[model samples]
Target: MVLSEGEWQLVLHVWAKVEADVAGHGQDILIRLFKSHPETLEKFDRFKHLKTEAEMKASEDLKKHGVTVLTALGAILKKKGHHEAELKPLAQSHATKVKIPIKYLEFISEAIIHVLHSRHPGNFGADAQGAMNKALELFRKDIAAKYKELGYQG
Candidate 1:
């Protein structure tokens, strides 16, 4: 699904507001993801042992990876229609090398949207939420397509 011009603006606007605390936001998003999907921890070597929210919160490794993923999303959001350029390689690496399941992308998207909604009560309106959700969904789909291209079923 394509985001209209106005929708893109809304997405970027809220993103900009959180740009100062992107790393902190990433930490919150990942924490939310793990809280909602406890099984997700097993997917990461460093985070596999972390079973509690406190453990996850105190993990520098988790914080580092979270920011990296968040940074990647930032790149995608700012680039607009050129998502495939970065997303394809990212998907290829995650799909083939990392062997990340596509479903995790969906979970992460949900986590991100949840964080945005909870953190930005006044700024994240329906329009921005819808736009951000659509943008993340597109990323998930695009990554899945790349997985398919590389003959990775999951």
Candidate 2:
């Protein structure tokens, strides 16, 4: 699906927020996401309830990387003079490793935006939307790159 500039921006803003939030609360977020989208559970080797030490460690590791990326994303967006050009490649690199689909990525972004808008009222507006678009574009590009890296093209 072709996302409008506004829609794409919203997706990116939410994507960064959701990734950071979920990294901090991986287990809880996984459980919630599983309940909401059970089909996605197959993407993982084992479910959260049956996690081993390695899996737990992996989750933590993923979160650490997420924290780094999310912080960078916030800095890029929050700082006025900062250029957001570099975020695309980084986002793509991360998304590829996670094996996230563009559609699902968009879903995550929208979910984050919903939570933010609902909780924060009118704090975010068009400017925020533009920021999100830049982020989402990078995310999509990364997802596509990941697919190629995994030896799949669709």
Candidate 3:
């Protein structure tokens, strides 16, 4: 299942407020991810070479990849989490082409919420956080299911 109507509304409201700064926010998410889970960088060849915060902050490649990821999430949110078809192909791409380990999903999700909290500075109270948690949990389940079907150990 996906988010309920009210949960979708709550997440969409917060998403709308942040969509305008996708590049900046997404970059921050990746930066935070790398800082908290340096092992995640090894999944991306271009990002793995980044040894410091300054390097990551300054890398156009990192910014581009960040935008790509956030844009994908924006697409899913725009459809109000009815993203089964959308996620299937993405799951295939990541499983086959990128070969990212399933465990990294949690790290990215945590990074996203961390950036939201840091940037918004106490804006996301319990309800907002809970809604996001539900939505993200749905996303992880959907993607993980597809990965399983495809027999993607990574």
Candidate 4:
């Protein structure tokens, strides 16, 4: 799906903040995404149980690896200055290990933005959107590169 500039920016900002582990960040973001776009939950199984300790632990593990990957991507983004090349591998890894489709990564980005906006409506207006757009583009690109380096394209 083609995201509008605003939507894309929202997704990016939310991603960066989540990466930073802002308080109640993940949960708040997920909740907002589910509420705003319930259909997005269909991308995963047992969505209702996502908040369980076991489920949360599983999610945390993924995010932990995600952070490691993101850190590496951040450096590449700083040098390369674009996102397309970087997003490929990250999408590939999610497809291989978690069996999630690369398209779903886009949804994950959307969900994150939905939640961040819900939590901080005022800040999510316009200027924040621009910042997030640049941030998420870089993030997506970096993640793709990392996944390729890790040989996750299977």
Predicted structure with the largest lDDT when compared to the true one: 3
Rank the models by lDDT, top first: 3, 1, 4, 2
Instruction: Note each model's CA RMSD in angstroms.
Output: 1.2, 7.0, 1.4, 7.2
Ranking by TM-score: 1, 3, 4, 2
Please write out the lDDT profile of model 3 over residues 1-154, one tens digit for every residue: 7578998887888888778798899799999999999888888887788999999999998999998999998798778777988898899999988887767888898988888777775657778888888888888888888998988863
Off by over 4 Å in 4: 1-23, 33-95, 145-154
lDDT of each: 0.85, 0.51, 0.85, 0.54
Q: Better model by TM-score, 3 or 4?
A: 3
Kindly list the per-residue Cα lDDT of model 1 for residues 1-154, writing each as its tens digit. Answer: 6878888898999999878897799899999988899877777887888878899889998889888988888999998757878887897788777788878888888898899899897889887898888888877777787889888964
Task: Give RMSD (Å) of candidate 2 vs. truth.
Answer: 7.0
Q: Which stretches of candidate 1 lie over 4 Å from their true place?
A: none
Q: Which residue pairs come into collision in candidate 4? A: 86-141, 86-144, 87-141, 89-144, 90-144
Whole-model alpha-carbon lDDT for candidate 3: 0.85
Error of 1 at 16 (Å): 0.5
lDDT of each residue in 42-128, candidate 2, tens digit only: 565534353443554456544564456456655554443233355455545545555556665565555444445554345457666
Alpha-carbon deviation at 146 in model 1, angstroms: 1.1
TM value for model 3: 0.94
Which candidate model has the greater lDDT, 3 or 4?
A: 3
